[PDB]
Design a protein around this nucleic acid. Sequence first.
DNA 1: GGTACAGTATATACCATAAA
DNA 2: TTTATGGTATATACTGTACC
Lengths: 57, 57
Amino acid sequence: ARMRWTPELHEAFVEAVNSLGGSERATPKGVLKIMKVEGLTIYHVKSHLQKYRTARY
Amino acid sequence: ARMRWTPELHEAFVEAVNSLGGSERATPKGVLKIMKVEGLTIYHVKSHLQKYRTARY
DNA sequence: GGTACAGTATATACCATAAA
DNA sequence: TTTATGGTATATACTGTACC
């Protein structure tokens, strides 16, 4: 299937990234392990963090 | 093949986008037709303009 | 009701580096 | 010399809309 970043999933992702101390500091694997979401791969998080990083700073 | 945005190709792409009056105004097809580069598809330009747009404004 | 396109989201491939 | 990872570049899929 193709992942959809629903506004909940994204809010999870953000809280995660904040805990990790901002988008720049945060790591894919780190975000992954904090979210603990069934079926979410590292590759899902990696791509999305890449966007999140650019649409921020 | 997989396209590589060599610093020349990119300089072409930019001049194009400028002629078209900035990244926001510019269109994939428009940039395409101004560059007139053998083997360059609209899909190449589309993706790259998407990046150019975010790493600018 | 089918193109052709723009805009956007997501995925995938590349490239370097560290650790073993 | 593999494996795992992060960063990054590029590609591919989705969604709407205008035109015909």
